[PDB]
Amino acid sequence: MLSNLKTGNNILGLPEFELNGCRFLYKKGIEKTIITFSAFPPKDIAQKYNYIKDFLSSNYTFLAFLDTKYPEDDARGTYYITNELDNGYLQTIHCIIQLLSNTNQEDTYLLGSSKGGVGALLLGLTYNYPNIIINAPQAKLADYIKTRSKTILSYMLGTSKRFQDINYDYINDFLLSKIKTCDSSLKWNIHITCGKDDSYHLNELEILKNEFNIKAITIKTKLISGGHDNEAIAHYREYFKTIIQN
């Protein structure tokens, strides 16, 4: 029962739930369903739910998800991938949305920036959520984790020295594989913004663009002001409300 999944935490008035290690906020509304994904916080700062305030007065249905809770000594998430390096966590998220949401797929919108934007792509490409509006995702996931936490990278590569390189390449390509194996017949509605000064992630977008191109899937991109920073996020927020409100 939903009320028995509560953790005792409360974010801006919304009670937190947890199911199968997956923490989420939920507010039931009407007309549309809004889904958001957490990005990396600073070291020793708790993972944060995204874009609550944007939809506090919206009265749409709202779900916000965090990343995984391991490794315990730097618990900032493993890019929505299980410690078995499989889809178990995304499967849990999909079940929560499908059973708690009161709109259909075409009226559901997936949001997130950076790691949060990768999480939106991972879920939406696996389970055919067509509306994905994100900012500055990575393409090569292991390369980026390496720059943010050596502790998380070494946890995900595992203790066997022989499979560390193998696991690194598998993680690096986990998002690119989802594009390679997604359903080309769906009427995808994918939007990807990126700061014009975000030279690293501008190149990452070119990698994603190429993978969609050889799949004959058309996406929308938009250059916004800023780097990989709060200035870009401020414009990305402005961008997704105008797309959603129209």
Residue ranges that bind Cl ion, judged by CB under 5 A = 39-40, 114-115
String of DSSP letters for 17-46: EEETTEEEEEE--SS-EEEEE--PPPTTS-
Contact 114, 138 (CB under 8 A): yes
5 or 14: CB nearest its own copies: 5
Both tokens assigned to 30: 């009407």
**Least distance in angstroms from the C-beta of 146 to Cl ion:** 13
* 57: three-class secondary structure by DSSP: coil
Which residues partner with 134 through β-bridges? 112, 192
Of its own copies, Cl ion, none, which one sits near residue 169, judging by CB under 5 to 8 A according to partner kind? its own copies
Of Cl ion, its own copies, none, which one sits near residue 40, judging by CB under 5 to 8 A according to partner kind? Cl ion
Of its own copies, Cl ion, none, which one sits near residue 100, judging by CB under 5 to 8 A according to partner kind? its own copies
138 annotated as belonging to a binding site for a ligand: no
Nearest Cα to 64, choosing from 89, 27, 91? 27
113 annotated as belonging to a binding site for a ligand: yes
Q: How far apart are CA 17 and CA 66, in angstroms?
A: 11
**Least distance in angstroms from the C-beta of 228 to Cl ion:** 9
Both tokens assigned to 13: 């008035």
Residue 242: count of CB within 10 angstroms of its CB: 9
Strand order in the sheet with 33-37: 6-11, 14-19, 22-27, 61-65, 33-37, 108-113, 131-135, 189-195, 220-224
76 annotated as belonging to a binding site for a ligand: no
**Least distance in angstroms from the C-beta of 171 to its own copies:** 12
**Least distance in angstroms from the C-beta of 235 to its own copies:** 32
- Is residue 244 packed enough to be buried (19+ CB in 10 Å), middle (13-18) or exposed (0-12)? middle
154 or 189: CB nearest its own copies: 154
Residues lying near its own copies in the complex (CB under 8 A) are found at 1-2, 4-5, 19-20, 84-85, 88, 91-92, 94-96, 98-105, 146, 150, 153-154, 158, 160-166, 168-170
Of its own copies, Cl ion, none, which one sits near residue 229, judging by CB under 5 to 8 A according to partner kind? none
24 or 37: CB nearest its own copies: 24
Q: Which residues are annotated as a binding site for CoA?
A: 47, 49, 51-53, 113, 237
